[PDB]
Structure formats: C-alpha cells, structure tokens
Amino acid sequence: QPRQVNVGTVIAVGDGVARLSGLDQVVASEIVEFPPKAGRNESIYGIALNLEQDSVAAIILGDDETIEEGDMVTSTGRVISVPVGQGLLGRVVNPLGQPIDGKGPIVYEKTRPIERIAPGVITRKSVDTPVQTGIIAIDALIPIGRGQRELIIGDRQTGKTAVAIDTILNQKGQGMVCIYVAIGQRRAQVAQVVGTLERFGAMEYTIVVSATASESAALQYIAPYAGCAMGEEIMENGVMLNGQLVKDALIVYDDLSKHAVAYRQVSLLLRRPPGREAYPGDVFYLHSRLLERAARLNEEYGGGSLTALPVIETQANDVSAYIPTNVISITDGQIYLESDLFNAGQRPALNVGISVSRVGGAAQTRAMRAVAGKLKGELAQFRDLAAFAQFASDLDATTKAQIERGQRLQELLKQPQYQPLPVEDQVAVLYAATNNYLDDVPVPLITKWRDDFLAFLRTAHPEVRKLIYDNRLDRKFPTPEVKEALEAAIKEFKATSN
Amino acid sequence: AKGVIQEIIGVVIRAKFPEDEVPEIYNAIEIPLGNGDRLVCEVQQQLGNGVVKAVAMGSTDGLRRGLEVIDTGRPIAVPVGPATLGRVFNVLGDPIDGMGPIGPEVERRPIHRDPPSFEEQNTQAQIFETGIKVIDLIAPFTRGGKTAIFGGAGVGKTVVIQELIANIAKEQSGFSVFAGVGERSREGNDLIHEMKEARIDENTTVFDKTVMVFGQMNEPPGARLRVGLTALTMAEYFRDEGRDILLFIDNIFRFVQAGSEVSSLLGRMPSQVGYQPTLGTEMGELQERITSTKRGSITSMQAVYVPADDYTDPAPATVFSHLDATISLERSIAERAIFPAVDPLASTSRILDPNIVGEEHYRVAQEVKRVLQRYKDLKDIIAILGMEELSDEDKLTVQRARKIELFFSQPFTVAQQFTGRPGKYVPVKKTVESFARLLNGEGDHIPESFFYMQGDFDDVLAAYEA
Amino acid sequence: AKGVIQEIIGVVIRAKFPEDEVPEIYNAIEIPLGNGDRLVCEVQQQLGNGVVKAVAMGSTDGLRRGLEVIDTGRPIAVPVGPATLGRVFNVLGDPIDGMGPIGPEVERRPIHRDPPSFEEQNTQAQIFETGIKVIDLIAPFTRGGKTAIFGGAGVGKTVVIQELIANIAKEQSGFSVFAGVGERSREGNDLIHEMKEARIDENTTVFDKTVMVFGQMNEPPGARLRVGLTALTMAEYFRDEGRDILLFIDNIFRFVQAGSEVSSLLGRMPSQVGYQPTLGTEMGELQERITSTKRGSITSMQAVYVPADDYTDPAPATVFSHLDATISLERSIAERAIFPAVDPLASTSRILDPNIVGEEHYRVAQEVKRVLQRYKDLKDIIAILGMEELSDEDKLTVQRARKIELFFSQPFTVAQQFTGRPGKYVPVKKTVESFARLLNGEGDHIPESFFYMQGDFDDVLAAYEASQ
Amino acid sequence: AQAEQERIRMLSEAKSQIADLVTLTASRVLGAELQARGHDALIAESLAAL
Amino acid sequence: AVDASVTSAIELSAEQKERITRELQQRYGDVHVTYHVDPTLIGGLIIRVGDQVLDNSLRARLSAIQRVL
Numbered sequence A: 001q002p003r004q005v006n007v008g009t010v011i012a013v014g015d016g017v018a019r020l021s022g023l024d025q026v027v028a029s030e031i032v033e034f035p036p037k038a039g040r041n042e043s044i045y046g047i048a049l050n051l052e053q054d055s056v057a058a059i060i061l062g063d064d065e066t067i068e069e070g071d072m073v074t075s076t077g078r079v080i081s082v083p084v085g086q087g088l089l090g091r092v093v094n095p096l097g098q099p100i101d102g103k104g105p106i107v108y109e110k111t112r113p114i115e116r117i118a119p120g121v122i123t124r125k126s127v128d129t130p131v132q133t134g135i136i137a138i139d140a141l142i143p144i145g146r147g148q149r150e151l152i153i154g155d156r157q158t159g160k161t162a163v164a165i166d167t168i169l170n171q172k173g174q175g176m177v178c179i180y181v182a183i184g185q186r187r188a189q190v191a192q193v194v195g196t197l198e199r200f201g202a203m204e205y206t207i208v209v210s211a212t213a214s215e216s217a218a219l220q221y222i223a224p225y226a227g228c229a230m231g232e233e234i235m236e237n238g239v240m241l242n243g244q245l246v247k248d249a250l251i252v253y254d255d256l257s258k259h260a261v262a263y264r265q266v267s268l269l270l271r272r273p274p275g276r277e278a279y280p281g282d283v284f285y286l287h288s289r290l291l292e293r294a295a296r297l298n299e300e301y302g303g304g305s306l307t308a309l310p311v312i313e314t315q316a317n318d319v320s321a322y323i324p325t326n327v328i329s330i331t332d333g334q335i336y337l338e339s340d341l342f343n344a345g346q347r348p349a350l351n352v353g354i355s356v357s358r359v360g361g362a363a364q365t366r367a368m369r370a371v372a373g374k375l376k377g378e379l380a381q382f383r384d385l386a387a388f389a390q391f392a393s394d395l396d397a398t399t400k401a402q403i404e405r406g407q408r409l410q411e412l413l414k415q416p417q418y419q420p421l422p423v424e425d426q427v428a429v430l431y432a433a434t435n436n437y438l439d440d441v442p443v444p445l446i447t448k449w450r451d452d453f454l455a456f457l458r459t460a461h462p463e464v465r466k467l468i469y470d471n472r473l474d475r476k477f478p479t480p481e482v483k484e485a486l487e488a489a490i491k492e493f494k495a496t497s498n
Numbered sequence B: 001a002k003g004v005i006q007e008i009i010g011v012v013i014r015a016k017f018p019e020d021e022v023p024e025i026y027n028a029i030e031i032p033l034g035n036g037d038r039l040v041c042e043v044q045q046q047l048g049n050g051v052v053k054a055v056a057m058g059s060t061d062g063l064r065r066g067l068e069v070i071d072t073g074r075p076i077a078v079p080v081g082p083a084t085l086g087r088v089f090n091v092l093g094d095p096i097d098g099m100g101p102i103g104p105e106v107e108r109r110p111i112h113r114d115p116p117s118f119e120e121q122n123t124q125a126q127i128f129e130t131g132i133k134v135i136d137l138i139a140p141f142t143r144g145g146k147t148a149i150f151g152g153a154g155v156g157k158t159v160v161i162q163e164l165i166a167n168i169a170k171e172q173s174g175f176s177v178f179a180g181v182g183e184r185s186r187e188g189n190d191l192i193h194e195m196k197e198a199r200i201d202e203n204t205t206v207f208d209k210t211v212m213v214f215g216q217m218n219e220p221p222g223a224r225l226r227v228g229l230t231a232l233t234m235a236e237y238f239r240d241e242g243r244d245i246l247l248f249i250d251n252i253f254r255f256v257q258a259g260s261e262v263s264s265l266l267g268r269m270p271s272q273v274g275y276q277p278t279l280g281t282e283m284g285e286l287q288e289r290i291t292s293t294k295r296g297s298i299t300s301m302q303a304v305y306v307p308a309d310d311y312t313d314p315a316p317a318t319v320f321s322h323l324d325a326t327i328s329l330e331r332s333i334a335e336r337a338i339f340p341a342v343d344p345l346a347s348t349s350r351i352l353d354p355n356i357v358g359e360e361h362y363r364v365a366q367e368v369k370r371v372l373q374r375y376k377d378l379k380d381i382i383a384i385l386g387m388e389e390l391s392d393e394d395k396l397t398v399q400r401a402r403k404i405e406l407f408f409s410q411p412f413t414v415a416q417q418f419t420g421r422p423g424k425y426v427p428v429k430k431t432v433e434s435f436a437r438l439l440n441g442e443g444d445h446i447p448e449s450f451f452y453m454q455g456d457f458d459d460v461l462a463a464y465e466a
Numbered sequence C: 001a002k003g004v005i006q007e008i009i010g011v012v013i014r015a016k017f018p019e020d021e022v023p024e025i026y027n028a029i030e031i032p033l034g035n036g037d038r039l040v041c042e043v044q045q046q047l048g049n050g051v052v053k054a055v056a057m058g059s060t061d062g063l064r065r066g067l068e069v070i071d072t073g074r075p076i077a078v079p080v081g082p083a084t085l086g087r088v089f090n091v092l093g094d095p096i097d098g099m100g101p102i103g104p105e106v107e108r109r110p111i112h113r114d115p116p117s118f119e120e121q122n123t124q125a126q127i128f129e130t131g132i133k134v135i136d137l138i139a140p141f142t143r144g145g146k147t148a149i150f151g152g153a154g155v156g157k158t159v160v161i162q163e164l165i166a167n168i169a170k171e172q173s174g175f176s177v178f179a180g181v182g183e184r185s186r187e188g189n190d191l192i193h194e195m196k197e198a199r200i201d202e203n204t205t206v207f208d209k210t211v212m213v214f215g216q217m218n219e220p221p222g223a224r225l226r227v228g229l230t231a232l233t234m235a236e237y238f239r240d241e242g243r244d245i246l247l248f249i250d251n252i253f254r255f256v257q258a259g260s261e262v263s264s265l266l267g268r269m270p271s272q273v274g275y276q277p278t279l280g281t282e283m284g285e286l287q288e289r290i291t292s293t294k295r296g297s298i299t300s301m302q303a304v305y306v307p308a309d310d311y312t313d314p315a316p317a318t319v320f321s322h323l324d325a326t327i328s329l330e331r332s333i334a335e336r337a338i339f340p341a342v343d344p345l346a347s348t349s350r351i352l353d354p355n356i357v358g359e360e361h362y363r364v365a366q367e368v369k370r371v372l373q374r375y376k377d378l379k380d381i382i383a384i385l386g387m388e389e390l391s392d393e394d395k396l397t398v399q400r401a402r403k404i405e406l407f408f409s410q411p412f413t414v415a416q417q418f419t420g421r422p423g424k425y426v427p428v429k430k431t432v433e434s435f436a437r438l439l440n441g442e443g444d445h446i447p448e449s450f451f452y453m454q455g456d457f458d459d460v461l462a463a464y465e466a467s468q
Numbered sequence D: 001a002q003a004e005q006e007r008i009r010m011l012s013e014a015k016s017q018i019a020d021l022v023t024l025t026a027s028r029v030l031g032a033e034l035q036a037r038g039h040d041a042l043i044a045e046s047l048a049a050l
Numbered sequence E: 001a002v003d004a005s006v007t008s009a010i011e012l013s014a015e016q017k018e019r020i021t022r023e024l025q026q027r028y029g030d031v032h033v034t035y036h037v038d039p040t041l042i043g044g045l046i047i048r049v050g051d052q053v054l055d056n057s058l059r060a061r062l063s064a065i066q067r068v069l
C-alpha cells in the first residue's frame, strides 16, 4: 500500500522547538512524525504550531536531544488526537495516550481530537445533579454540580490536591468517571496519587493523564486537552462502568498554573511576543478553551456532563495575579484554601467567607439545600461577630451563645483526610447541629461526637440512613416521617453517651 | 478578489492578495473550508504589498498555507430586521439556535458604523422610565445612556434584566438586544434562554421581544471583540426605525480583554498593564453608538466585572469613563428576601440633579439615602448596647430606614408565575410622591411587612385598611 | 568534527561544523586552547547550516574567532563507580584533589540521562531522625525523599546543612554524594573537607564514603549549570546497585541562576524576572533524577537561596513542588537570634502523618502549629495595643507561643566557631516529649528567656533549678 | 474481577509478543533472503512506480 | 534544480545507479540524486523527491503490525 506524504527537513532544533523548513500543505496543528533513524528506533512526534512562510515552527512532544538538523519529518495528516473510550479506565497515560504504568498496551478504537470547539451554546442545560464531594464544607456551603467548573485555588501547600483526591475517591457508586490530569507534577507525586487511588479502589473508574515536570513543555501544554478529550468522549458516548452506561465525567487539572507556565515556555521558545508577566497574550483564551468544554448537555444531545476542577497555586496568596484572576473569571465557582486556616486546625481549610459557587442551591440535593441554608447564615453571622468575639468579653448571653454555635459549626466542618461522608450522613449531622441538639457538646469534642454519631447510624440505625438517602429529593425534605426516627436517633445517642 | 494564505500563527492569519484587489481594513475574508462551510476572518491591518493581517474568528486548526481566500468587499455583514427578533446569533450573525437560517430577503448591514453626529445628540438629558422604584428613584437611567451592574449570581440580575425588557416592551415598543460578550456558556446560555422563554408577559415570552448575540469565552478573541458591534448593529436598525431599544452588554470587561488579546496577537506594543494601545478609541467606537438621537434612543444596561477588586485597572477605568449610572446589587439585600437587591447606597447616577429630574425628585432622593447614608451605623450601637433601652429620635429614624428598605422591593411581572403575585409598574411620579409622603410621615402608624412587597404607597394604604 | 568558532558571546560559543557532521544537541565539543589543555563546551542548540551554539563551561575569555573545535561525538561523560569514592571532581569529571586521575577502566557515564520512569518510582518513605528539634518535629527529614531548606542571605542555611551532615553522615549505612552547585568555596567546601575527614567511622572516615562535585561560585555559568547533573550521574550508579545514598546538593538556586545567565547569553526570550523560558523543564530534568527507585533509595537534602527575601521568585516557586519536606528559613527569626530560624508555619512535610511518624508526634506538631498560628493572628493586636487586651486563654496561648518560638532554637556542634554554647543532639522522641510537656502547661512558670538555645525540656528545667 | 483483568491483560501481552515474534521471524523469511537471493531488479522498478 | 534522495538496503550495480538516475530525469530535469544504503532499513521503497517521499517495502510490515495489534 504505497502512499506519498509531504516531508520537510529540520533546519534548526533548539530547546524542544524545531523549524521544519518545507512542509507545504501542512495543517495548522498536525503531528509531524520524525521517523526513526540510526540511533533512535522509535518516533518522536511534534505539533506544527507556527505555520510561517518558508518555515514551520513545531514544538516537540518528547526528548529533543535526539532530533538533529537535516532530519526528515513526515507530516501525518491527522491533527493531534488521543485514544479514548472504555479501555482507558484504570490506566496512567501520558497526554499522547501511551501507557506509562507498564500494564500493557492501551486498547481503543476511537481517537477523539483534542482542541475541539465548545460543546455548544444552546446544547447545554441547567446544572441540577450534585457532585458529592464528601467534604461537609464543600457539599454544604460551596456546592459543586455535574457540569459546573469549580476552581480549587490556594497557597502552595494547603490541601488542593487532597480535596481533589477526596472528591475523586467519593465517586465510588455515583456513576462518575473521574479523570486526574497531572500537569508539571513530579513523577513521585503522581505515583503517590495513583497509590492512594488504588488503595481505596478508585482506579477502576479513574483515568490519570500525567505530564510530569521532566517531560517536554509541549506534553504539559497539551496535557489538559488530553483528558478533556477523554471526558468529552465519556460525556458524549459513555463508558461501561459497573454494568451501567456512565455518561458523566469529572476532570481534575492538577495544576493549571503549571500548564500556563508550560504554555509560556513554548510561546517564548517560539519567539512570540509576550504579554503580562511574560505570559503570552492569549492565556485567557488558552484556559477558556480548556474550561468551556466542561458542560452539562441537554437530553437531546445525550444528557452527559463533564465537571472540571482546575487547581491553582497562588504565590503568597496573591489572588490578584494574572493566571489566578483569569481562571477565577472563567470558572463558575471558587474554593479558597488558606494556610492560616490550615494551620489553625481547620483541616479542609476552606475560606467560606470568600469561596463562592455561582450555581448555588441548584447543585445541591433538596435535603442538603433545606438544611444548609441555616448553616450558611449562622456561619456568616459568626464570621461577622468574630470581631467582637476577639476583643469584647462583656457581650450578652445571646452573642456568647451565637459565637459558641459558630464554633460548633466550624468544628463540625473539620473533616479528616480520606474519610468522605455520604450525602445522608452529612444531612443527618447538619440537621442535628442546626436544630440545637449539639449545643450542650463542648467544642473540643465535636469531631469525636460526629464520628461516634456516624458509627451509631452505621451500626445501630442503618434504616434511618436508608430513609434519609431515599427521600433526599423531595421538595420538603423535613417531613414528619424523616423528622421522626432521626430526632429519636439523636436523642438516643445523646442519652447513651455523655 | 481571491488571495492565498501565507502565515497562520494562532488566530492571526496573514493573506496575500493581488496588488489592485487588496481588501479594505475591516473587510471579511471567508476562508472556505473543505467540508462546505467557511471561516470568516476580519482584516485588521493592511501591510506590505497586497498582504493583509486578519483575525481568525475561528479555530484555524485545519488550514494549510495555500488555501484561497474570498474577499467580501464589505465588513462583517449581519442580518438586521424583525426577522432577527427572538433569535440567538453568534458574532458573524449566523443563528446558532435550533431554528432555520435567516432568509436572504433580510437586509444585511455592515457591522462597523459611525456613531451619530454631534448635531443629532440631545442637548438635554432625559430620564428613562424603567418602572422599578429603587432604580427610578436613586439611580435613574438615561435615555441613550449607560448603566453598570456590580453583582454576582443569585442576586437576581437576570430577573432585573427580564423586568427591564418587559417594562420597555409594554410601556413603549422597547425592542431589546442582549450581547453576551465573553460570558460563561452555562450562565449566559441555558440559564438566560430558559429563564426568558419561561418568563412571560401578556401571553408573550420575554425571549420573543429580545435579540440575543452570544460570543462566549470559548470563542477566539476576534469573536468576543466584534460580538458587541454585532449587537449594536441589530439595535441600531430598530433605533433607526424609531423604536426605543434597551441593549444589554454582559461583561464589557470581556470585550476589553478580547481587544487586548487581539492587539497582543497582532504585534502591537502593549499599553499600561499589557492592554492594547487603542483602548480608549476602541471603547469610543462602541459606546458612542449607544446614544439618544432625536428619532430614537438606545439605552444600555451593561455588566462590569473588575479583575480582583482593582478599580484602578485600565479596563474598568475606561468602562467607567462611559457610564451614566451604576447599580450595585448586594448579597445581603438579596438574602433578606427583598428580591430587587439594588443597594440604596453605592448606586449613583449623574441624572440625580435638580436640573433634569426636577427639584422634587432630587429633594426626595436626598432625604432618602440620607437616613441610610450611615448605612444605619446605629446597628453597631444597638449591637453593643441592647439599643440602650432607649435611643429617642434614633428609634424613629431606624423605623423609617427599615420601612424604606422594605419598600424598595417591587413585584416582578416576570416572576409573577413563580412567586404568585401580580407585578406592579410604578412611574417615576408615583415613586417620588410615595417616598415624599413616607418621609413626611404617612408611612408611620403602619408596621413592617406591610411595606415589604407592594407597588405604590397607595397600595400600602389599601393593604393597611384591608 | 573539526569545526570553527564563529562568534564568542560571553560563555556561549557559536561554532560552524560541516554539513553532514553537525554535533548532536548535548554533545561535548572541545577547543584545543593550546598549552595541551582543552576547553570542553556543551552544545545546546542547532541553528542551521552546521552552526551550533555551545556553552563554554570555562573561562572562554582568551580565545579568538576562527579557532578550531573538535566534536567528541558523545555528551559529557563522568567516571562512576567505587573509584569516585573519596574524591573531588569538576563538572567535567576531572578530579581536582592531589590524587591522580581516574583510570580508563572506570566506566564513564553521560551526565544527561533520562529520569526514572513512572514504574520505577518508590513512594515508600519514613522519618529520618536528625536531632534538630524544629526539623524533627515540624518538618521531619524524610528518608528516601527529597527535602530542602529555603533561606535568605543572612540566615544560616550552610550552618544547618553542616550540622545535618555532622549528625547523620556518621551512621550512613551507605555512601553519600555532595554537590555545591553554587556556594562559597570557603565554607561550602574546603571546610566541609576538614569536617568530613575529621569524622571517623571504625577507622574509615566519612570522607571515605563520599563523592564530592563542586563547580563553586567562582566557576563560569556552564560549570554551575551542569555540576548538579554530574553529581546526579555519580550518585545514580550507587543508587542503581542498591546502596543507600545521602545526596546533599547545595543552593539549587545557583543552578537556576547559571541557567538564567546561559539563556540570556543564548538569545532566548526572557521570562518573568529575567529568568530563562525553560525554567520548569530544566528543574524537572534535574530534580526528577533525584528519586528513590525500586532498586535503591536516595535521601536527598537540598538548599535553596531566595533572592532578596522573595519567596515568590520563580526559582523557589519551582522548587516548592519538587519536595517532600519543605523547611523555610526567615530573616526575622534569624534577626531575633534564633539561629535555626525555621518558620514552623511556613515549613511542612509529607510524612507528618500519624501512620508514619506516630500519633503522638502528629498531635504534638499540629498543636505546636495551631499555637503560633494564633500568635501570627494576634501579632498586630500585640504590636499596637499589647498583651493586656487579649483574653486569658489568648494570653496563655501567646506566652506559650513565645516560649515555643524560643524553644525551637538549638545549639549546633558546628556553631562553636562563633558561639561558645556546646552543641546538642535532641532525639525526636525527646523533642516530642518536651513539646508535649510544654503544651500541657508544664514550664508555664519558667520565664521565656530560659528556653533560648537549650536541649530537651529536662535541660530547661535544670537551668531553671540552677537559677532557682 | 482483578484476577479476570489480570488474565485478560496477559492474553493481550501474549498476543503482543506473538505479533513482535512473527515480525522478527518475518526478517528470516525475506530479510535473510536479501543476503543472496533477495537482490532483485523488479523490486527496484517498484520504487519507480509512483 | 530539485534535490532527490533514494535509499535501499541492497547495493545494486553501478549501472543500477544510472538506472535510478535516468528514470527520474523524465520528471523536471538534472535532479541531484543522493544515494544512501540505510542498513537498519532492511527495505523501503524510498523515493524522496522535493518535499514529497514515497515509501512502502517494510512499512507494509509495520502496517501488518498495526493490523494485528
């Protein structure tokens, strides 16, 4: 089967960027091959980004130490694409779809091209189905729904990856196919994340796309569009998960600041004009292309969804930087994690004062929506009154009790790691706390009280948990039926212990 | 009038034309794609010999370095007319809704037009009758003016927009145009289309009286740059027809950002913090078309997003240089069940002076917002004193301030089918008279929850007597 | 082979080679330089018709245009094996000690090698006791994992590194490698030599188990750029055959700065504050080689210098994501005469987990951070008003925080040269017990001045009894 | 379920080895023939087919 | 002119070199044909003229690999 393909010659290879000379009729984002030669028995692909006149500046998806001036490049007609489908679940693949966990070749039949236009303007639908993070703070105060892109922004080490991993672990039976995209993240950390996911059995529905720091800047640049294409295939065609056709995907970009750094590197090596903070001009366009592909399509287009959780580290909590403000503008919600709250014992470390979710109550179950309104109001008023709490000691009994209640709620939100709470459990705990059943419990023992209460419901009364989970969608969740056998359980637990 | 593409660097395409057939500065290019459709580029710079540098308006992930280009001669042509009513369009004017394409019989007008001359500008500012009490009392609009919204989601900004569209469509013809410039596709679309198709007024949906043009963040910088001009062209057709138009631009800051990205990709040197050198002129070429001539007026109610909270940023400064009033929706007012969350403070207007609204309007608007000028700073003394068991006059001023805050709410004709309450339209004269009587003291001897959700002071009196 | 020099821009040498014999990207080309000694350059880019841009890694200030360059055809090769033990090398692998050159029979390995793949990564780690209270309590030194200290110019990064080496290099259970990519040739080296040769392990000195590659500050940017890779190649041989390796690379920031200077001379477009566009990739290539794999374990300990006192600088910001245990040295703490100068709030570690370090250790560390977090919250209140306005419990937490801050200070055996206080080695168990006792309430009566530069809590109590 | 996945992944690995082995032995059937007999002129014409 | 390049594992006769030369002279003109052997490539219908190349002798073997995998 002889075929004739256009070829060019590498006239200048540098820091992972090569000028390919004559490659006429090359598409603007092809995959040039660099065929194997003496000393290199494999192929090193590259992306033909700049289609200049009498020169094609192409980044290299791999080690450029082997490309030599005068080498041939065959312009494969295919625009950059990644393998997608059922075969990728449970595999760690570099952004080109090649497995790196050494568990065998990736089995696939369809290759969805990365860098695709948004799913549509009218094709989307209102976000209604919640994404159960398993963290009380996120699920109650900053809800995340299927098809909503929620940013996880914080300082260098506050729990961003921990929150993303907890969310990924929690989607055990919720019909979600989580995707973890590691951009610029050290290979040992990706190994740790894979080990954590495998330990909790969460690698039977997770795809890990890793472009570590040592790998070329082009791989990190196309790292989030790989994986985003995988999630697009999941939300448009579905993947067989636990015998059910799951069409919901959850993608976590491990760090978009490192992705922006990689794009800045590939742009500056291409000698494109810089912009603010040396980033190229269209970095907002970069991240908007990446994030607007996360949507909840209507029933006519499949009814699938793709939930994105971009992660951004901020230098010295400088939210007003370039990339943080860009991605804050792009996303539909923000989750600020502070080192000050993290050190003060608040383990999830969410700054609920400034963390917002524009979707709001529409991304919460009716039980959660009915119970968490009082939570949010009381927490906001406690934050307001913290000014008096810090100094004034002559405040009336009302203010003292209200500060005490705020502390009760804050200690309630102090969740450990790798212990997600299902929706029924969070609903039960928040109903107990917001209905004054927790007032007599001292603050230092509230976490132990919650753990013991959950053991109580898991062992003594599984039926109340089943009842709460069964009718969590009704318009009026606190029906006398659900109201009884729950207040009874709380009263029994209170009487028996302490 | 056919050329060849030379360079393709991102969304900037350099095309070489014959020497005597070079496209004009703002003409379209319409690169034909293999699978039937076309990629409409917009020229930005004539340079060299027969070479033009154009912005993509599209992906440009499938173009070689030899594709032919078909100059159109005219700038981006967009359908205008009653046919383009109740439909959703992109930057190029191609309808992106499920309905069929626009027929060729509809007139196509160039996207770029000069603003009305100085001779046609009105020599006296005129208040715009919106019907909302808080809007028409503290921060009145301007006929052919601009207004900004500073509020996130969940504060009812969409409902305020819907009420404005319904009021302008009922009281006057009020054809409305909505410009989605760089807004989230989830918020801008399918939470505006559905909330306006479901919303109805006199068995006619709000969406049927509104033209929507949507350039979202996923689109290239050129699309978000020219979506505003597309919306202005659609509104300007109806303005030339003599009908008053309410034009909404969502996140004009995204229009500024699109301009900045276009300039950065075009090789222009940055200005200030990376922004385009032609910032003021680009704002002028768009905001100056929003003006009230003698035959018609285009009132604008834009939404402004400031990066972080920096109002010193050049984009908000240039936006604010072209503003006549600001409306600041507040989370606290929204969560206090008062649906119109327009903060009585932080909502200014340049029409609020005696020489336009009138001496009585200014007087009543100054008596109000004065008892609130402190933001009821008395709240702190109550907090740390238990009201001191007696505050003398302060009790009366607190009661009056709470009464006014409750009274600022007004029923929504678009939310009538949601909250089950008919909407009341309150003219400006009714607003000023009602608030004058309330400040005189006729609102006294009436408890709260009777000024919560009503149209006029007469309605409050009727509720009290019943 | 046999090219000619076209341009000599700084330490970057552009050479022209025949069309069909252009050197590879990372080949090592040489100028004869006369006198029988040659200058070894490293190629970085290929520019066209046989023209390559190479980094001199040498003086490159006495050679003209048109000089011939010889292409070796291989990247820079350095000796590896037991022959490198107890010897001091350049970036080029040439020994600089008084002993003779390495024999040809010793294997030469290229200094540009791929980092271990994803399969080979070893995630198993455990606490490495070091005897420093703040390090072993707040940011445990991780065995088999990368850890580094971030300090300014006046803080004692070198003192901490030297004390760490003195504490842990005697009981190595394996060889070690030291690489001062950028550091004073006075205290970074030629004084670590005396310390290592003085220490004796059963009639074999610590220096007999150490490979030392410097490329000191005096060296041109190329040597500082590639000395880290040379040290990594020298240590990967020992890691690959199973030997436990202690790796001490000093001032990675100097490696970054050398890369920045080389990139500026190479004509690359600057990024951020004059740094190279390829900062992240260079950091990845160096750091991903410092990994404990399934064949052997490398217990890395790096140092990072923050320019001025800016922790938002691109180099430390890039380092932060490549570490298991982060130690932050602050200028204010050092100016308060707290020589360790470690900020517990800004210093974290991955193995600070109850399942790894111990439940009591984890609880103690979390409490010692929640205190001093309350103190950082009340710093302004204290500064402008004073201690009186705080509540009683807030007051007690504040003096407990000040006592803890004073107690983190610890004398170092290497600090005898300018401080007369004898050094102390506090085991991690003693540190945990002391801090638990201090947090319980014991030691409240003791004034804060008694916690300054002491060992465990027993020493503080003994000093209090001595002063009655 | 993991054991079934382990079994099926070894079948793919076994099949991959077969594909790798057959091509290496395909160098014996014709590549080794190129030593003496494989020198052909009609194949050179096949290059000039175009 | 146009620089063409053809490679083959077999070192055909010197006349064969001429046979390769004049079968390409029919297209364009005095093409500067460069000859290699490529021992690692046991085959290959390598015909590289200008910016276009033709090749399938062992690529069919690689294509067979793609089919079986």
Ligand SMILES: Nc1ncnc2c1ncn2[C@@H]1O[C@H](COP(=O)(O)OP(=O)(O)OP(=O)(O)O)[C@@H](O)[C@H]1O
Pocket: A155, A156, A157, A158, A159, A160, A161, A162, A163, A313, A347, A348, A415, A416, A417, C320, C321, C348, C349, C350
């Ligand atoms: N309950 C908790 N929730 C969140 N984080 C926790 C919790 N308990 C401990 N941690 C800390 O969070 C760490 C997990 O990594 P984390 O999510 O903070 O990384 P990161 O923000 O991605 O930072 P890096 O820049 O180092 O990659 C743990 O090692 C521990 O220090």
Ligand SMILES: [Mg+2]
Pocket: A160, A161, A254
């Ligand atoms: Mg992380």
